[PDB]
Amino acid sequence: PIMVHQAISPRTLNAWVKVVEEKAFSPEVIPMFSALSEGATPQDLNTMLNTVGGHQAAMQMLKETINEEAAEWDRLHPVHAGPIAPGQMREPRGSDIAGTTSTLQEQIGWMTHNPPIPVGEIYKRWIILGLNKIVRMYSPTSILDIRQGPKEPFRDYVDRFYKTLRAEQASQEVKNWMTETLLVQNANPDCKTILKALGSGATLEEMMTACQGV
Amino acid sequence: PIMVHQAISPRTLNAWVKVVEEKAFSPEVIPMFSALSEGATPQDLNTMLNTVGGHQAAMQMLKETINEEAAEWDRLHPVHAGPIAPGQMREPRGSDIAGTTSTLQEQIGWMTHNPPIPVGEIYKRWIILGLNKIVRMYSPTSILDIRQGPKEPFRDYVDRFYKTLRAEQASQEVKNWMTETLLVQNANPDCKTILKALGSGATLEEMMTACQGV
Amino acid sequence: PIMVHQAISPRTLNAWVKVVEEKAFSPEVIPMFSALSEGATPQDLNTMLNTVGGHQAAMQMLKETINEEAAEWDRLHPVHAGPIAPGQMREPRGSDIAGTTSTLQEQIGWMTHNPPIPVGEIYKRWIILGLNKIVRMYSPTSILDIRQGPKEPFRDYVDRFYKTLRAEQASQEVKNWMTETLLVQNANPDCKTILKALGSGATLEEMMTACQGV
Amino acid sequence: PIMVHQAISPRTLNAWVKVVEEKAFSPEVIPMFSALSEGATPQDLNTMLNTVGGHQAAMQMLKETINEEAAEWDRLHPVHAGPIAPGQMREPRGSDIAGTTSTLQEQIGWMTHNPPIPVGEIYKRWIILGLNKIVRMYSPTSILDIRQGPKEPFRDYVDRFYKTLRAEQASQEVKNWMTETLLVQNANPDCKTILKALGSGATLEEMMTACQGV
Amino acid sequence: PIMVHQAISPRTLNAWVKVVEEKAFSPEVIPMFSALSEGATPQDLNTMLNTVGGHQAAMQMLKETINEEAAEWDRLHPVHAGPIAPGQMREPRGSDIAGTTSTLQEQIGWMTHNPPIPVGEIYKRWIILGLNKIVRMYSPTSILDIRQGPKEPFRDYVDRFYKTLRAEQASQEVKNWMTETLLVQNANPDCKTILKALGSGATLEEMMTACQGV
Amino acid sequence: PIMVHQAISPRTLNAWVKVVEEKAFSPEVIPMFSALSEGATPQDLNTMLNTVGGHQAAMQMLKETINEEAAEWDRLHPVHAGPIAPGQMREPRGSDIAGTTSTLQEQIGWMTHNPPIPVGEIYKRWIILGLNKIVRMYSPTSILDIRQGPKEPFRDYVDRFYKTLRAEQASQEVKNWMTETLLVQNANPDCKTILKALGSGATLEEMMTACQGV
Ligand SMILES: [Cl-]
Ligand SMILES: [Cl-]
Ligand SMILES: [Cl-]
Ligand SMILES: [Cl-]
Ligand SMILES: [Cl-]
Ligand SMILES: [Cl-]
Ligand SMILES: [Cl-]
Ligand SMILES: [Cl-]
Ligand SMILES: [Cl-]
Ligand SMILES: [Cl-]
Numbered sequence A, B, C, D, E, F: 001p002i003m004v005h006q007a008i009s010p011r012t013l014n015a016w017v018k019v020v021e022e023k024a025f026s027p028e029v030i031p032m033f034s035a036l037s038e039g040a041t042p043q044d045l046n047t048m049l050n051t052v053g054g055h056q057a058a059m060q061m062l063k064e065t066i067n068e069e070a071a072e073w074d075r076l077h078p079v080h081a082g083p084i085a086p087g088q089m090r091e092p093r094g095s096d097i098a099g100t101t102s103t104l105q106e107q108i109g110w111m112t113h114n115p116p117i118p119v120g121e122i123y124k125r126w127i128i129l130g131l132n133k134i135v136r137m138y139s140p141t142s143i144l145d146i147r148q149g150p151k152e153p154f155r156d157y158v159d160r161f162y163k164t165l166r167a168e169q170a171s172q173e174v175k176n177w178m179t180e181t182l183l184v185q186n187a188n189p190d191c192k193t194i195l196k197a198l199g200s201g202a203t204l205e206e207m208m209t210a211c212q213g214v
């Protein structure tokens, strides 16, 4: 990554490869990806994606999302005809942001220049957008089906609930509705009664400590 | 972390991930977290939290604590209306300290500027506050129940006592009362007699060496 | 690699060696190679190749490809007779780009000089060209033979399809034809009907989510 | 640690944690601790101690020793009343040296300032003092009980002798008396005769090579 | 290694040690050695050799080769009598290049001085010369004995051929003769016929793809 | 180690610890030690020795050798009475070189000052001197007892010979006599005849290749 240019480290690459083998597309893979690609050029971002073996339905799916975002960027940013003056550099296309039609030096130029054109962070947003689509498709369970089993420790039910909740790509408002509606509704009879008694404004801490004995 | 900005290292991230898998929320997890997040920006702190898979009841609980602290910061620090002058940067909100509504560059700006606004260390205190709440809730044993078993080496009883003591979030004054009261009271008959004979001002060293033979 | 010269790191070398032992010549080996050889001089590129034990039919094959590209470079770039002036350095031959007839200092000279002569990136392209030839020869399955089995989850069929597709060295236009023709054609009866109903312009996401239940 | 400030490295922390799990409080733990804490601030020293899980009787014992040394420092160094001038910084208390009542910046200030106030090395001496107390208490064998068994290779007896000797916290004069008295006295009959014949001034090398055959 | 002097890294040393234990004197050991000794002083080169345990017939053999090359250097470079002036440094002998009679500082002096006297790269060539002698002696199979077995995949026969070829220290002209003569001659009947039909100028790629079905 | 001071790295320390556990006092331990202690101050050298657990007969033996060398240094270098002037630093005693009576800063002073007083390299020579004494004492086999067994491959006999030779601390002249006398003398009948026929000036290479078939 990068403001002095640097190659992607052996142990960044290796760490990313192992993450995908072990955890596939579990929600936490996406923060790991972003963490390992901090300050990454499009070339470095493409490296991480291309070094993934297997999971090629998702990697192909990711390409289409990236292409869709590229087409959208080109629509909003039409390229103007003309010779690039000595002090300036050309406007990036969608394919330049995705790294397929731009050199490393062009990518370095845009990121470092005074008006920064952060193609690294733009392309990364496109990748993360497509990764979210994969997680949601690749999640086995639906949030609607998470119901506490009889004699299930609440703590284990809440772990399953917010884990499954974590893989829906839901906005904060949508995730807020699911919490106040499904969590208490789908608790088991013994603890559900207790939770109705806490009222309409109790924290998760209060709900978990309330059903700790039961 | 950071005064030159730096990305979170592959082996910092990986170390933190393994800590939580192996040790869950054992008291020592919190010092490990703080150690691995030294000089961290809110973006780096959020990275560590988001890269944790599982334990999503606690991670959700942690969000509420962070939001409570954010609401408290906003109450004490009301934002004033106006255009941010060239030489200055805006006042951070609670959400800016938690990183959700601020950019990396804004976080870098506050931490490096001459009046330092250490959003990293402020947000970290909020996270550590919530981590303490988790440890205490997630501790299986109570300090009141730690009693030395018949024929139990004192050393093993003291290990269990101060381990269980370690997970209560007790102030120094509260932890002091538990030591002078419960430790000797809940020792086994043979060693308890010996300890009453040491008097009301003996060190742990003297108590452990006194009951070494018995 | 390199603009200050640096030796190839112990853990770059070791990482590359393990990659080839574990994954042989699977498509992802090539992006891994390029990633680990970022900014590499021809000497560093030769190091990575020579440190590979076994697979000597491929490594020998790679030599011929490199020699073919060297012969082509010499044809296009004929060397002129004359003593190299103090301020300049000689024109590289194909063997100079491949590192066999040039010193490390000559390779450093070309890469750093004001008109950059990127022998590292030129030789790397020749190596990657030959690596593609190996992958295609060393691929066991043909893309034509990938047919979805009865009761096979589409997701698994698409994984096999784009994995096998990945090892053909096909241009984008050739890979595009295979997608729109073979993927739907070679699906199993139950899902194939569903896919004909999506129409002639649906994304992979829509095709995978359509055949998710079936 | 530090004269430019630096955070404690991931692999320093991890190394220290593993040392205590594997070797507990074996004499060599103390040199390992000092080695891993070279140039450490009190904050870094507290980190290493707090990240130790288990062994909480010793860690609590260590706190008391540190508090005793703190009380002693305060007695010898009484704090004077007054506002700290711009060019100077306040006098450290015992709690400031132990890091509990001082900030990282105050600790950095004292260590770097022209009259250096090495709170890191002072606090480290207090910690090492308490670690020695633990080793001696936690040693199972006494030096008095190490007697060479019949047919025991001297080399193995000398290994046991100086290992057990190593955990007594004995001054050089006390350890010198034990060598010249117990080592030869407690050897087995066959080798003991040989050693009396070497005389009152022979080296360990001469004693070991003398009893090599026997 | 080195133009600022540096000590050999822990992980360079360890990597080299493991290479020799696992792979002995397989052809690839020599490129690994050269890679790990890039920019090495004679002291660093001697370190790598001396840290090898076992294989002492080869390490002794290597000493003689180094001594032979040293004697040859002294013959070609006779030392002149005189006091070394302040601005200059003495001429290196063979033993100075091998590090046995020169200090680290003398080795640093020669490598860094304006007329560079690369004792590191000279001594390294002597070591690599002797390593080649070992590989050839320590190779179990002869290139003459590599014959394709009945029903042996050509690819496996070519792997064995160029592996065994790799350990002969043969010049390019000698290795060229073996390829065009033995490879086709010693193929099995079914594939041999096919290869005669390709003609006297076909690549390894064409030969391997020709005998792929057979 | 060091001309800017640096703390001993976590992975230097750990590497040294593992070396001694796995290989004890095999000849190669000594080059490993020297390699890992390149540029080490006496404090760093003492760290490596003190972090060794077990083997305390040898570590104690090493202390005596170091003390003997210290006494010898003091005899040759008598300390003169007087106050150390501002521009100068005091003369080191034997105990100052061994680090027991000197501070880290004094050790840094001597090593960096214009007339360098390399206490690191002096003390290291004393340690290496004592390590050689240990290896020789701790070697199980004598060079005199290495005789080639009937049907033993010469290569294996030469490995045993120069391995056992390696642990005698023999000068080059003493090791030279053992080679020309014992190696051929103690070979087995079949190969011994062959070696007498090579003559009185053949290399190890010629001797090993001569007895390769037999
Ligand atoms: Cl993310
Ligand atoms: Cl969520
Ligand atoms: Cl903490
Ligand atoms: Cl506590
Ligand atoms: Cl590639
Ligand atoms: Cl593809
Ligand atoms: Cl110590
Ligand atoms: Cl001792
Ligand atoms: Cl080589
Ligand atoms: Cl070859």
Ligand SMILES: [Cl-]
Pocket (backbone or CB within 6 Å): F030, F031, F034, F128
């Ligand atoms: Cl040595």
Ligand SMILES: [Cl-]
Pocket (backbone or CB within 6 Å): F162, F165, F166, F175
């Ligand atoms: Cl030897």
